[PDB]
Design an enzyme around this catalytic site. Structure first.
Site, mmCIF file in Angstrom:
data_model
loop_
_atom_site.group_PDB
_atom_site.id
_atom_site.type_symbol
_atom_site.label_atom_id
_atom_site.label_comp_id
_atom_site.label_asym_id
_atom_site.label_seq_id
_atom_site.Cartn_x
_atom_site.Cartn_y
_atom_site.Cartn_z
ATOM 1 C CB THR A 106 -0.948 0.026 1.216
ATOM 2 O OG1 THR A 106 -1.389 -1.307 1.505
ATOM 3 C CG2 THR A 106 -2.167 0.892 0.931
ATOM 4 C CB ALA A 146 -10.249 3.354 -2.897
#
EC number: 3.4.25.1
Lengths: 201, 232, 239, 250, 220, 228, 204, 199, 213
Positions: free
Chosen positions: A1, A49
């Site tokens: 990530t 997101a």
């Protein structure tokens, strides 16, 4: 990530990792942080997101509408400028957008880093993620603006691999794309375990 | 509702407002009215006479003071008189909230004529034919003011209004000289009431208010017969 | 608010009080302009000044930016609104997209705002028109026009106002591609234009010039006599 | 329901707003004003509408109203319709003081009132302002600033201005006596006095039937001075007396 | 800060002190908590002074325009309805403790004002923090239909009793007497609490004070 | 007798709208042609003076990627409808992710065509020519100012409208190709143009699935001029 | 509390025929020194001042908003404002926000426009009026301010002993609390003429 | 968080700005400009919450530029500082408040050098020097105890060196880049970027 | 106080075949210790070519399913055709972002026939983010489901792993086998299992039951 973005002698480099989940539970290895806005532009994903996805749809909205107004591609500076303020108006309501704006400007190479806190800065190198300490740290030790295109792929793949080694939030596949004057060039998508056999042996 | 609010009253080829000219014609055809600012206070007289014997002065009044220290008279219709009086009472609180003190004479004329002049440019009707006479006592020197529909106001000691306002005023010009007292002001008020009389010298055909530096005093017709019976 | 019909569509093909309000521009003072690759110029006449007082504040040309020049015709009130409205636009385009205002962006605003200003009820169209003179970014020149219906069109040269066909017929000498090879020839072109357009002269003539990034300059009534001297002497030199 | 309004806003077959003509006639009727050149000072002159001697006149200045401490304005037109603009512009100049805590240059203030004066013109068929007023004062930049308001929306500002049909005869006298500094405040007093002597039809030019005001620049006072009638009496008397010395050319 | 009163046979007598302070520090000994309403009605303030003054100015505003329009003496319940309606809309946000009383042609009326707006009619009411000892002296020593002079003695002794008891009660005593034919506002009355003379003289003299800049600004 | 500006006609219809329908007849001439290879179109710029700059005047605009449009009569009001409909094409790409269909431009424009009313403002005199290619192939569409939509293989507007369509009815057929549609239309265009044909008189507007956009480019139109 | 940030004490001590007012010169944050230049007392109108103690934003807000209303008052009618109407005007603005109230301690020291009568008032942030002829003070230390007035101040005082008393007042009181210091500015006004004096404290 | 120098000269106006935009302990972007140039007689300095900074740059600059071309002349630093107090008043009480630190600086054709002090609490101050950063407790000796209001810019730069020395003592941060603009009677001028080596 | 966010149960399993798609969901509605209804299918057909799953709160899924189908007739009466699968996923993301201030708690998977007839699997979250995946398993039983789906379907975690496409009935019996071992712990998964078979011609539904004890 964790991702990284930097510009060098030719164009800009866009790198990302495909492992994003909730907690330590393995869920989705296909997560793609790099999102296409325009054929000559590239987006990123940080924080929320869906916020990155939606505000890029509005970014593509104002860019394409303006592209239909004066029949000219707007500068990336004036593109995400108002985008930084429009997302900033929701500050305090829980929205967090740390995305980076990649692409080419008519005046030359450029890179833009936008935050929901209101930080918008144009500079050479930017990276967002948990493995940023490994991304920034091991790259900046060997980083140079004079690197070539193949050397940019090697250092980006190395910095991403170092971010996928100790840090548990990084893994899956390595998303690495390159930006050029005429347009960004899609490079390759490689697995972390396959590149482990490359660097380690 | 409609809510047009357009300005339809417009400039004449001469530049004036023909509707306001009709307004001053309603004032010129108004009831005889007079007031006198002299020395200590102001005296108001005018006239009220019923259409028949069926009406009395003990209930409905043509003269209602705006405040305890401020009286008012006027010419023209009563319905629109009580309308601008109602707005004057309300506007008196908009002043009193900030000041917490009574109000100067001209302070009413400024805001009343502003709303009146606003009601000209504003849609619907206009100031109509009601020309108000504002009086009061402040700072040791009382005042007597009168405005018109167009909002133009002037200050003086005495004037005549309504019908024969020019003839009665020319009589007051020779009678009033230097300064006068309250008794002398009432005396020549009987003279200007006897101009259009009709109902002068009779207590039930007129109503007499008086302003003083101690505050406005509204006396019943009883005192009107007291001073004038015996008139002059 | 206020409901009423500004103007209605007549079978003759146009509105009434809008297309006839073009006469408010037609009855205005004469105004012209000339774009150039080196220096851009313009002009105005019929100042109607008293000459005994200060006329500097009645100036018919303002600047949103140093590179943007506003040339208008007609009454002053609607012109000042066009000034302040375009100032809100040039300042909004100063805040957003920091680089200065392109001519297509400001003409789209001024023209289409006036159009949508003619659309909604309770809004009377401006009795004025305007034409933009200046320099586009990267050295390119610019000129355009404005219509009471809000249509913008770019000419090679600007001739409008009173006697638009008279000055345009005088442009027969301006059609030469050699004009202007130099700034002195450009001012000499405006000198011949201002002498012909229209009633003139020697006093009411008011103009200014701007070359590339250099800000516009208004010459004193000194060099104006020099340009009028050589222009009047050119007739003696042509014998 | 469309036939009730007279279409004062909507354009006219003459090619221009038709109500503006009658508006210029409204100010052009009974309105009498002027202006004087500004050299280290300025003055104002008007006509007192009141012919009644019984009036109190306790309001000090009649036709001249003070918008700011260092800046005031002359006015011509309907009284209360002008009084609405007095307190309005006074509040516009006050909200500017509420902004910068510093006085207001007249330039952007006059243009602001012009944008307000066009409100009744540009929408609703409203009656345009029947009041055209002057401007006086002082600023840090241009010094004494003398401007003029027009019903068409322009600021017609000059250091010598004319208001009214009767004052239109003074424009020839303004340019006949025209000079620049040169002119003293005293010279402008005799200039405007001869202006009224030529224009106003009042016999002997009575001093109490016309309004006169002045202004001075003092540090940091800059007083707008309302004058007693004593100096105006002796001024016009000394003026026509100087005219009695100006007829010696015969 | 204590307000109390009692309604005698022919009228109403009210009282209040002048003491408004914070803590044991002596600040303001002189404060007027009795405010004007109309010839027939008075009002006694408590709690927050400024908020209750703006409230009694709005009530005096409504009674000023209405009584002037009617030309007659209004009832106490006319202002009480707007008092209980406005304070009820806030549900006690603005603390309000007042004594609403007056003598009209209908006779005397008394209503207790609370921040919620609940009003009840009693011969006597006690408001403020000194309402404990005042109610005790009242409830014990009160008999109905007393004259005006005995009511003055009862109000004087009750208010003077709550002085020592309550912490913020003292300084001057204010008297409020309301009747049909007479309206009496008597201030001040008696000052039991004082502060003695200085123990020594610290009075300053010249030469011990250094002045940097002394500016002179003549007027006129 | 001016009543309400919204009043019907005894025949009848809306007064003010029908008056603007007759106002379309003074506009520029533009002729679209539908062809399997692509939808072409052209217009006459109507030069008003030799000073005219060629690129400043364009009567054809591009709404969506493959969707074009044309203007008639009054301009600025239609120019507002252009970009305002483009916002609805981008909102179409929001949810649907793809390009707006050419037939749905009718619902994106003609539905809001005349919303005018006295309260809560005046009609339009401009007719639009909608070009484009949807998933079903080439489509030529046309709408009026009143909002009535009709599908036409060839449509002319402005002055030559009645005359151009009356003459073009014979030359049009189902087998018309692209290059044939361009060179057979300019025969009518050179008949309906007053000025001598040059590069600044007329412009071409074309849309094809495989070649775009295009639109059209200059200096190629001159190559077609020598092919007259 | 917010009153402990800027702090400040405005001491207005009325004399016999005149009224005086004094405030500290120091303007800073807590015990960290910034500058002594900012004056918490501002002139308003003619022959009238006002002291302010509290948040500097609300202090300057009252300065600009009172200037707003006062200019509208003086420009409408040329009469000078009376101090009683001024206090009701101050308490009006402070009461305009009941649930939004600002933080200030307004102290008005002014004269009578008509006569030589002085005036003193001190109101809270909600505009609680207090009208007396003795003195008005608003500040941090409760014991020191009123304590020096009880130990020194008398009803009838001449300007000589008025400035000397308020001097040692601003000395033995203000110097007790560190939030106020670094000099004291004194303004004494009277119908005759206006006088202004200053003082000095430690520079540490 | 960081301190910018407030040096005020009689003729000139001198400030300094640290260009490091980096976050936490990592070294990322050192070239970010903290100085906002508005007009020739007025500068701008803004530091605080991220989004609030740039917004005050957009609003104040374009409003000053609005007044600039409206009246033809430039605002004075006094009218500019008090105009920002209104924006700081809207900063204080609003549904979405703002957080800032720095102040305004500029030159005037009459009052000459002007340096004000701004805060997110809107409190105005006008002082020959400013106060910020965590190293101000050594500036009450180096900067405050030794200062000359009438000194020129030469000794002012040396005083900036004495501050920069002890600015980094127990701090593990970087802050290598310091940018300096200089204002004189002719307007804003630029000075070299200050960079200190490690060892 | 009252908590608007509460989990009513449900589980989603969707496998995308070559020319087909296999969607499965549990019919057990279980909140707490009580079983409300033993038949509560969370897979409804938006159109004949598309079937969407549902998870999380009950009424939110029924409301969202009806709102999506309500907009289908709008697009049907507009362009004279139904909505594509990708358009439904993006429009749903915009619907989920409109509530971003206070959104639903919901997890959906859209599946059915795409342009080429392939199966569709989309990973949804309440904030309206998504992408195209081959397989996804929702609900609280996803613990051991995803690793096993990465084995057989995803072709990972295998030594010398050959890659071959999966047939229609192989994934069917795989779904039947995995939910038996996945019900040993999670109490929300069990009872009758609603199966949805998506084919090029049409979409079929079936049911498989588990012990109710």
């Amino acid at each position: 990530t964790t991702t990284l973005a930097f510009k060098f002698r030719h164009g800009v480099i866009v790198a990302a990792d495909s492992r994003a989940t909730a907690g330590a539970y393995i869920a989705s290895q296909t997560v793609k942080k790099v999102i296409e806005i325009n054929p000559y532009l590239l987006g990123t994903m940080a924080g929320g997101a869906a916020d990155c996805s939606f505000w890029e749809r509005l970014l593509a909205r104002q860019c394409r509408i303006y592209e239909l107004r004066n029949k000219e591609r707007i500068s990336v500076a004036a593109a995400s400028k108002l985008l930084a303020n429009m997302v900033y108006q929701y500050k305090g309501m829980g929205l967090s957008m740390g995305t980076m704006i990649c692409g080419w400007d008519k005046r030359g190479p450029g890179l833009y880093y936008v935050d929901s806190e209101g930080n918008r800065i144009s500079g050479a190198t930017f990276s967002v993620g948990s493995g940023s300490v490994y991304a920034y740290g091991v790259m900046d030790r060997g980083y140079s603006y004079d690197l070539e295109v193949e050397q940019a792929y090697d250092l980006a793949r190395r910095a991403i691999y170092q971010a996928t080694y100790r840090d548990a939030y990084s893994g899956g596949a390595v998303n690495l794309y390159h930006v050029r004057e005429d347009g960004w060039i899609r490079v390759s998508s490689d697995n972390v375990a396959d590149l482990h056999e490359k660097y380690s042996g | 509702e409609r809510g047009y609010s357009f300005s339809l009253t417009t400039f004449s080829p001469s530049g004036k407002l023909v509707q306001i000219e009709y307004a001053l014609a309603a004032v010129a055809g108004g009831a005889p009215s007079v007031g006198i600012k002299a020395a200590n206070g102001v005296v108001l007289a005018t006239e009220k006479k019923q259409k028949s014997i069926l009406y009395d002065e003990r209930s409905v009044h043509k003269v209602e003071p705006i405040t305890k220290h401020i009286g008012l008279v006027y010419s023209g219709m009563g319905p629109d008189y009580r309308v601008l009086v109602h707005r004057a009472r309300k506007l008196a609180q908009q002043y009193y909230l900030v000041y917490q003190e009574p109000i100067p004479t001209a302070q009413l004329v400024q805001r009343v004529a502003s709303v009146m002049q606003e009601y000209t440019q504003s849609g619907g009707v206009r100031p109509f034919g009601v020309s108000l006479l504002i009086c009061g006592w402040n700072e040791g020197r009382p005042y007597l003011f009168q405005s018109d529909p167009s909002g133009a106001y002037f200050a003086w000691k005495a004037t005549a209004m309504g019908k024969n306002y020019v003839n009665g005023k020319t009589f007051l010009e020779k009678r009033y000289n230097e300064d006068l007292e309250l008794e002398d002001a009432i005396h020549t008020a009987i003279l200007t009431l006897k101009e259009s009389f009709e109902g002068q010298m009779t207590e039930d055909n007129i109503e007499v208010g008086i302003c003083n530096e101690a505050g406005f005093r509204r006396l019943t017709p009883t005192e009107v017969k007291d001073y004038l019976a015996a008139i002059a | 608010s206020y409901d009423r019909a500004i103007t209605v569509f007549s079978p003759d093909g146009h509105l009434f009080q809008v297309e006839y309000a073009q006469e408010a521009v037609k009855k205005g003072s004469t105004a012209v302009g000339v774009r150039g690759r080196d220096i851009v110029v313009l002009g105005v006449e019929k100042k109607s000044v008293a000459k005994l007082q200060d006329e500097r504040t009645v100036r018919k040309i303002c600047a949103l930016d140093d590179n943007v020049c506003m040339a208008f015709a007609g009454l002053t009130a609607d012109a000042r609104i066009v000034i302040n409205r375009a100032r809100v636009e040039c300042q909004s385009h100063r805040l957003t997209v920091e680089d200065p205002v392109t001519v297509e962006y400001i003409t789209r605003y001024i023209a289409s705002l006036k159009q949508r200003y003619t659309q909604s009820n309770g809004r009377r169209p401006f009795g004025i028109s305007a034409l933009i003179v200046g320099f586009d970014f990267d050295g390119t020149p610019r000129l355009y026009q404005t219509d009471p219906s809000g249509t913008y069109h770019a000419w090679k040269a600007n001739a409008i106002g009173r006697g638009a066909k008279s000055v345009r017929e005088f442009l027969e000498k301006n059609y030469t591609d050699e004009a202007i090879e130099t700034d002195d020839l450009t001012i000499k072109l405006v000198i011949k234009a201002l002498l012909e357009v229209v009633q003139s002269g020697g006093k009411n003539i008011e103009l200014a010039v701007m070359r590339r990034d250099q800000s516009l300059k208004i010459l004193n009534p000194e060099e104006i006599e020099k340009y009028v001297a050589e222009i009047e002497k050119e007739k003696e030199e042509n014998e | 329901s469309r036939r009730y309004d007279s279409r004062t806003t909507i354009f006219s077959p003459e090619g221009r707003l038709y109500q503006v003509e009658y508006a210029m006639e409204a100010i052009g009727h009974a309105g009498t004003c002027l202006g004087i050149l500004a050299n280290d000072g300025v003055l104002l002159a008007a006509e007192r509408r009141n012919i009644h001697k019984l009036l109190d006149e306790v309001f000090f200045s009649e036709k001249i109203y003070k918008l700011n401490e260092d800046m005031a304005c002359s006015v011509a037109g309907i009284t209360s319709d002008a009084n609405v603009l007095t307190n309005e512009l006074r509040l516009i100049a006050q909200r500017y003081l509420l902004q910068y805590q510093e006085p207001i240059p007249c330039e952007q203030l006059v243009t602001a009132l012009c944008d307000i004066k066009q409100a009744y013109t540009q929408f609703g068929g409203k009656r345009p302002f029947g009041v055209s007023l002057l401007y006086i004062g002082w600023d840090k930049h241009y010094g004494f600033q003398l401007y003029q308001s027009d019903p068409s929306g322009n600021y017609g500002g000059w250091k010598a201005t004319c208001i009214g049909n009767n004052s239109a005869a003074a424009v020839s006298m303004l340019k006949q006596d025209y000079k620049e500094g040169e002119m003293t405040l005293k010279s402008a007093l005799a200039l405007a006095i001869k202006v009224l002597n030529k224009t106003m039809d009042v016999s002997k030019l009575s001093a109490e039937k016309v309004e006169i005001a002045t202004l001075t620049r003092e540090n940091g006072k800059t007083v707008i001075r309302v004058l007693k009638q004593k100096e105006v009496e002796q001024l016009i008397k000394k003026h026509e007396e100087e005219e009695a010395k100006a007829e010696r050319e015969k | 800060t204590t307000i109390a009163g009692v309604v005698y046979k022919d009228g109403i007598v009210l009282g209040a002190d002048t003491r408004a302070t914070e803590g044991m520090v002596v600040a303001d000994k002189n404060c007027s908590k009795i405010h004007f309403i109309s010839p027939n009605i008075y009002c006694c303030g408590a709690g927050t002074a400024a908020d209750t003054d703006m409230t009694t100015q709005l009530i005096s505003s409504n009674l000023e325009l209405h009584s002037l329009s009617t030309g007659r003496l209004p009832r106490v319940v006319t202002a009480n309805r707007m008092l209980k309606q406005m304070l009820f809309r806030y549900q006690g946000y603005i603390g309000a403790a007042l004594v609403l009383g007056g003598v009209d042609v209908t006779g005397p009326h008394l209503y207790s004002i609370y921040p919620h707006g609940s009003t009840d009619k009693l011969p006597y009411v006690t408001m403020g923090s000194g309402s404990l000892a005042a109610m005790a002296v009242f409830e014990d020593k009160f008999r109905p239909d007393m004259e005006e002079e005995e009511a003055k003695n009862l109000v004087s002794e009750a208010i003077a009793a709550g002085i020592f008891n309550d912490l913020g009660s003292g300084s001057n005593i204010d008297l409020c007497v309301i009747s049909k034919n007479k309206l009496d506002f008597l201030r001040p009355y008696t000052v039991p609490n004082k502060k003695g003379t200085r123990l020594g003289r610290y009075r300053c003299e010249k030469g011990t004070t250094a002045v940097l800049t002394e500016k002179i600004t003549p007027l006129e | 007798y001016d009543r309400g500006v919204n009043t019907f006609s005894p025949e009848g219809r809306l007064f003010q709208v029908e008056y603007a329908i007759e106002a379309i007849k003074l506009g520029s001439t533009a002729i679209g042609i539908q062809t399997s290879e692509g939808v072409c179109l052209a217009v006459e710029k109507r030069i008003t003076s030799p000073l005219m700059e060629p690129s400043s005047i364009e009567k054809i605009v591009e709404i969506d990627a493959h969707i074009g449009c044309a203007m008639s009569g009054l301009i600025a009001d239609a120019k507002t409808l252009i970009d305002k409909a483009r916002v609805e094409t981008q909102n179409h790409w929001f949810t649907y992710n793809e390009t707006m269909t050419v037939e749905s431009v009718t619902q994106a424009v003609s539905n809001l065509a005349l919303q005018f009313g006295e309260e809560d403002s005046r009609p339009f005199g401009v007719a639009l020519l909608f070009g484009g290619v949807d998933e079903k192939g080439p489509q030529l569409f046309h709408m009026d100012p009143s909002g009535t939509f009709v599908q036409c293989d060839a449509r002319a507007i402005g002055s030559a409208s009645e005359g151009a369509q009356s003459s073009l009815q014979e030359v049009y057929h189902k087998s018309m190709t692209l290059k044939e549609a361009i060179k057979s239309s300019l025969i009518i265009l050179k008949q309906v143009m007053e000025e001598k044909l040059n590069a600044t008189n007329i412009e071409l507007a074309t849309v094809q699935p495989g070649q775009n956009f295009h639109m059209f480019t200059k200096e190629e139109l001159e190559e077609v001029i020598k092919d007259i | 509390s917010i009153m402990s940030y800027n702090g400040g004490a405005v001491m207005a001590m009325k004399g016999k025929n005149c009224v005086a007012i004094a405030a500290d010169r120091r303007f800073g944050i807590q015990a960290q020194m910034v500058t002594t230049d900012f004056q918490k007392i501002f002139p308003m109108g003619d022959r009238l001042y006002i002291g302010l103690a509290g948040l500097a934003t609300d202090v300057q807000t009252v300065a600009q908003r009172l200037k707003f209303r006062l200019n509208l008052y003086e420009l409408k009618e040329g009469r000078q404002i009376k101090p009683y109407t001024l206090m009701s005007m101050v308490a009006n603005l402070l009461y305009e926000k009941r649930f939004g109230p600002y933080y200030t301690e307004p102290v008005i020291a002014g004269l009578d426009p008509k006569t030589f009568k002085p005036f003193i008032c001190s109101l809270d942030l909600i505009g609680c009026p207090m009208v007396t002829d003795d003195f008005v003070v608003s500040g941090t230390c409760a014991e020191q301010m009123y304590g020096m007035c009880e130990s020194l101040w008398e009803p009838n005082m001449d300007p000589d002993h008025l400035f000397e008393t308020i001097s040692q007042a601003m000395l033995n009181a203000v110097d007790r609390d560190a939030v106020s210091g670094m000099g004291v500015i004194v303004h004494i006004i009277e119908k005759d003429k206006i006088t202004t004096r200053t003082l000095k404290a430690r520079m540490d | 968080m960081e301190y910018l120098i407030g040096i005020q000269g009689p003729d000139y106006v001198l400030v300094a700005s640290d260009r490091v935009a980096a976050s936490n302990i990592v070294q990322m972007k050192d070239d970010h400009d903290k100085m906002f140039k508005m007009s020739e007689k007025i500068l701008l300095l803004c530091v605080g919450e991220a989004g609030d900074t740039v917004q005050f740059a957009e609003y104040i600059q374009k409003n000053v530029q609005l007044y600039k071309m409206r009246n033809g002349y430039e605002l004075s630093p006094t009218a500019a500082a008090n105009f920002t107090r209104r924006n700081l008043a809207d900063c204080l009480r609003s549904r979405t408040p703002y957080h800032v630190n720095l102040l305004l600086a500029g030159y005037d054709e009459h009052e000459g050098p002007a340096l004000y002090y701004m805060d997110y609490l809107a409190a105005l101050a006008k002082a020959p020097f400013a106060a910020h950063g965590y190293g101000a407790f050594l500036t009450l000796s180096i900067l405050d105890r030794y200062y000359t209001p009438t000194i020129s810019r030469e000794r002012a730069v040396e005083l900036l060196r004495k501050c920069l020395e002890e600015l980094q003592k127990r701090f593990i941060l970087n802050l290598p880049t310091f940018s300096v603009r200089i204002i004189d009677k002719n307007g804003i001028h630029d000075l070299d970027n200050i960079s200190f080596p490690k060892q | 106080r009252f908590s608007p966010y509460v989990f009513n149960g449900g589980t989603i399993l969707a496998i995308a075949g070559e020319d087909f798609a296999i969607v499965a969901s549990d019919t057990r509605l279980s909140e707490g210790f009580s079983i409300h209804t033993r038949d509560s299918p969370k897979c409804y057909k938006l159109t004949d070519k598309t079937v969407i799953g549902c998870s999380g709160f009950h009424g939110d899924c029924l409301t969202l399913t009806k709102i999506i189908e309500a907009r289908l007739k709008m697009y049907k009466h507009s362009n004279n055709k139904a909505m594509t699968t990708g358009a439904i996923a993006a429009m749903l993301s915009t619907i989920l972002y409109s509530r971003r201030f206070f959104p639903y708690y919901v997890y959906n998977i859209i599946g059915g026939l795409d342009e080429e007839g392939k199966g569709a699997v989309y990973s949804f979250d309440p904030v309206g983010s998504y992408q195209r995946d081959s397989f996804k398993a929702g609900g609280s039983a996803s613990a051991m489901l995803q690793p096993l789906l990465d084995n057989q379907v995803g072709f990972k975690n295998m030594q010398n792993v050959e890659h071959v496409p999966l047939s229609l009935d192989r994934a069917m019996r795989l779904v039947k086998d995995v939910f038996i071992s996945a019900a040993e712990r999670d109490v929300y998964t069990g009872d009758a299992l609603r199966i949805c078979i998506v084919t090029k011609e049409g979409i079929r539904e079936e049911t498989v039951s588990l012990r109710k004890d």
